Symmetry: D2
């Protein structure tokens, strides 16, 4: 019985109860996805490629129906023609919003990439602002909760859509649970039932037994190289929601008069189907992994957020080293414990629009994939490193144990 092994025996026993809970959620979600395959009568011919126009591609259409069934929506859009999560989100915004309309984000300022999209960052690019669509965001209370009086003050007759970002992303606040989201929807719908509630669902898929579309969200969007891709999707994004709303997204994604009826699937179907099927289980690996990281690092006297015993709604997990050297050594050890490009150590790197260098471990099968184990953060006080994902719980245990042995 070694050193670190002793610590592991202890910490693993400690977290076992919560890990078991994660497995209960995974079985529930696995059944849910299986039921969705089944109600849509998925067959092996549904993996066949389409070419050219992609008209009447039943494989593509069936997959979208499977997505809609799982999220409990009327319709979905899940294609490689949606190139990412950001692209999926932008498709929702431009798809629905029209000149004179206003978008209100209530979960505080959303992730930085949306900056140019809404138009508060650049010019001439074709932002919402360029198309006469208004945008604002309501900051969170200091405690990370929604500032309801502030939201109330902001909602006007011109407010067409309310934006909710489930995951904290890089923001210093807790990710919003489905219960918290339900409360937000109830609140806005009580003010105006016609207001469209959109939730940026990235990293939350299959973390709970429920999704935002089950607590009244009208439409949601996410990334296929995160949770729902199950580690297999090579690219893409998804949209799920009301039929009228998904129709609009489709016209934005292709063109009016064609919309979602068109777009060749080529060779992407099998990986999307199989990835979705495995997604509940693979998500469970990343969650189990996060709790392990949180428990182990805390044990080694390192600050963890969230806490190993925190409620979980997404995959996000950070650890604050309060040490530049410790942070870099850890991120490098994570790369060194990765399957792909393990020998290409990350270093402090310049990043456009940022005053601080960033460090990123990304030894993955798919470029930029996040359900896979990665690590990153800005190199500045308090030296917070995001260490999350993992295709297997085994991989996370191995990598984190080695990262500890290497930096602490």
């Amino acid at each position: 019985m070694t050193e670190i092994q002793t610590i592991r025996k202890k910490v693993e026993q400690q977290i076992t109860s919560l890990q078991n809970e994660t497995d209960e959620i995974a079985e529930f979600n696995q059944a849910k996805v299986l039921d969705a395959f089944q109600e849509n009568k998925v067959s092996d011919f549904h993996f066949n490629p389409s070419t050219g126009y992609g008209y009447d591609d039943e494989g593509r259409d069936t997959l979208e129906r499977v997505y809609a069934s799982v999220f409990k929506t009327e319709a979905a859009l899940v294609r490689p023609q949606i190139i990412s999560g950001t692209h999926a989100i932008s498709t929702v915004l431009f798809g629905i919003l029209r000149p004179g309309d206003e978008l209100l984000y209530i979960t505080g300022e959303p992730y930085d990439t949306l900056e140019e999209i809404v138009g508060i960052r650049s010019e001439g690019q074709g932002s919402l602002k360029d198309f006469q669509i208004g945008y604002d965001a309501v900051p969170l209370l200091p405690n990370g909760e929604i500032d309801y009086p502030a939201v109330s003050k902001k909602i006007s007759a011109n407010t067409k859509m309310i934006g909710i970002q489930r995951s904290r992303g890089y923001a210093d606040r807790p990710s919003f649970t489905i219960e918290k989201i339900k409360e937000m929807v109830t609140f806005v719908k009580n003010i105006n039932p016609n207001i469209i509630v959109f939730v940026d669902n990235c990293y939350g898929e299959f973390v709970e037994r429920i999704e935002p579309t089950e607590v009244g969200a009208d439409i949601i969007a996410g990334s296929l190289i995160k949770n729902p891709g199950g580690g297999l999707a090579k690219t893409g994004g998804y949209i799920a929601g009301r039929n009228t709303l998904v129709d609009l997204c489709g016209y934005r994604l292709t063109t009016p008069g064609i919309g979602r009826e068109a777009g060749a699937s080529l060779y992407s179907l099998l990986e999307m189907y199989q990835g979705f099927f495995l997604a509940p289980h693979v998500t469970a690996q990343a969650i189990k992994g996060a709790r392990f990281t949180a428990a182990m690092l805390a044990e080694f006297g390192v600050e963890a957020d969230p806490l190993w015993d925190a409620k979980r709604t997404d995959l996000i997990q950070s650890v604050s080293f309060h040490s530049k050297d410790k942070m870099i050594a850890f991120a490098q050890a994570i790369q060194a414990a990765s399957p792909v490009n393990a020998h290409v150590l990350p270093i402090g790197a310049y990043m456009p629009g940022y005053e601080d260098d960033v460090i990123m471990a990304a030894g993955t099968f798919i470029q930029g994939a996040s359900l896979e184990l990665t690590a990153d953060g800005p190199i500045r006080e308090p030296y917070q490193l995001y260490v999350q994902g993992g295709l297997t719980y085994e991989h996370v245990k191995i990598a984190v144990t080695r990262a500890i042995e290497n930096s602490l």
Copy 2:
């Protein structure tokens, strides 16, 4: 020699000189494309796939540079993410136009699919109109020429872009040659040099030694399942033009902030490169075929448009039988002389937004591809059938001779 063989010997001698000119154009164009590959140092690594976000895909970028080199533009956008010619065109319009801007098509009303796009066909789908962008079309003169006085009267200070459709499509007018297009461009630029000239270039690629971007067009667009795909591209579209304009198109195709810097190529690069290399030559097969069809049908007392000895700028070829039966029999024979689904008899079919039944031969490798031999037309007087494309001149001669033998 059989009878038909005797007619062929005569007709083939008659058109030889023109077929030779087509071959001369093919060699010029083949050299143009080769020089572009060399200039851009095309390598086998340029065929490699990219996954995830598709950042720093040199293969994708190099393909784009090759397109730009051939079309003699600063920039190009060429990728699987563009699902068709219509999508390419829409991307140009929404990419460049903004609220208060006006689009003026000068080549008469453009192809029907653009109806919904501009907003004269529906409501609420996110048309140019829905986004406060103005549109109009100047009808052609009765002889099919541009109505210059009408054009002059409709150009205002708010006219941001001029639209030109090279190919006649289904319009009862001749396709516009590069020389004619040059006249148009010179004219509108004389009125306002800052006006953006866009040419829908479908079916015209490699038919002449020059493209519209060489006669003053600022930006062009087309489909990869037509000419530039060389029969090999399974899907896609292209945009080529000035860097500023192509940048704007990129933000529309993806999102602001990202643009053309993202989008996984997956496995599509090789077919696009190889198809483009083969495009000048495959285009020539389709043109030689067109001339054969025109000359043979005329010889059999059937009306052809264009005439065998007409100037050619695109692939479009029609024959008018003034007989329902002959028209149907001929189209059926074309399907029967096609490689794929030869046994699937075309019959009068309903087409959305069409009072008349249509008949179509589409026995192709790629779904809806048109550089391949196809035949189609609405079932009504004067019973005009479009018989065009052909991956090989041999295929067209065989199919057409048999179609004649089966219907006349």
Copy 3:
């Protein structure tokens, strides 16, 4: 707390200790495969396709080196040019064996497919017998152990190779553990160290911490649509062993004078790499699944083999219903609880060379894949059904719970 749920709470607590052991093995094996990726410096460019001859395909070569590293061999052969497990095995036999040589199987008669291969079933097909290569097999003792005196009697100067089939397959004997195999190797090597020991390793990969190549096997072969494909490999087989021996296999697989240096990888690399990486973990799911099936069925008074508490060396798991109806209802429920073709119920089916109908549940992503959950058996006393595989432990729990609710 429901009926069956109560039974599950009980049985799951009971099997927990062994399941945990399976997870320890999985973590060890995950580390082992990770270490193999790392020592071979696996990078994202190693997933790139090769075409034509496939000469100097580093992606293909690196993968084979990763396989060799994991199995602790000098060399391996793992390509889609090996179309299956049977093909892999036959390649080993014809690769090494020459006229006058004799093959001796000591684990009793091997699986039926090898019948034509060795030549004890047909004629003129090019069996070992057709090529003047001898074959025999030593039956097991009644207790399922190796009959060592019988083996000793059989080994002659002409015995070039000894065959060992690790997995019981359909045979009514226990699968041979690695320790048992070590004993066999020691025994034959003591008689003649020059005798080549070959192990058919199908279904045993990653079930223990060790493989036969670690207890002295010279060469091994298996299927990529079983354990090592991790559920992702679309086809294939592998060979691993001594360099001289793998060289010979390569000449058989391609041609002499070329061998393994050639063969295009096309698009198969990523799935093979990623599948191998996930294989320890996915294998663990199928093992955990088997123990669950064994424990649950036994609880419902149904005979299980192996027992939930048996030592495990492969994925094989059966249950004997002593009831035709119960057996068929169970197999059908397994299909109905599968992701693909769930609505296509299996029925009693004729099978060539068999007196009895067979039933097979195979609602899988990959045609004929076995790491995925399936069920099959011959429809005859005692109505033994093989219920094994599972990409996730969750899937197996769900499917088995439903199969019980449906047939018992």
Copy 4:
């Protein structure tokens, strides 16, 4: 007109009549292939992938039937599993031959790669010799014709198969026309009608209106990265012949008991069908190019073989410069006028089993493909360079004119 242009005008007029005959052959062959697609009811579903074992792949089977129809054989084996022409040929030899049998090549010693296969090149690799199969070759007469008395003397009762190599390869003799091959076949069959006649058909496909299987050959084989692949097949080989013989080949390609009934097609079907459809026409480009090269070089006082006005049966074309410098400069110029890796300067290179350095131009889409334009030769007197292939006649004219301009 420039000078070179003046020479071209003259030379092109001179060869026109022969180029026209090539086009006539192209049309005949195109019709032959089209009729085969029709006869076999080729459908778009025939392009669908198969996974796993590849059982009941109708697309794969239909492709095989199309090949058989074109070659006028009972059966064909055409698949990605055959990695080359050599592999196809080896499969035929080991598939049919058995211990005590003898193979007699009558067209002199065949291509070098077959050396190891037959067993006159190495030891222990599993050659025909290692498997107790006899081999011999009858040298050609000095004029390159068959030595009939020597052939008669070497045919015995143990002569199971007669080998005929259509193409000269690197041998200093003319390629054998179908008429010549017919003479050979008639002769050997007169000696023994039960003798199996095999023709290595590489580079000869679609060059004449007839194939060897139409002049008595029992079985033939070739490469898909040459003629029948139409420039599109990324890998592979074919075997066509009598059902009994093709059956035997199947058991060798896979295993006895299984044969041709197995092997996943994955994503290779479409390119194989489309390539075969285009093959007659692409072949014609390469032949027209060959004639252009022969006539142009001769016009410039360089020795050509074959001569511009020679009978053609395959793609092979050489030119002898009697100058190292000119030879090297010309090959370099061909690479520089190639689409892929144009910038990668060919230089004298070592070649295993060759005392002399070789130079090669291989700037192709598919690695090692030869229907595409390439150039190669050993660097030694009389400095003979093979300059052949070409996906388009335009490409050859451009490359060759530039090569002339750069070296002469």
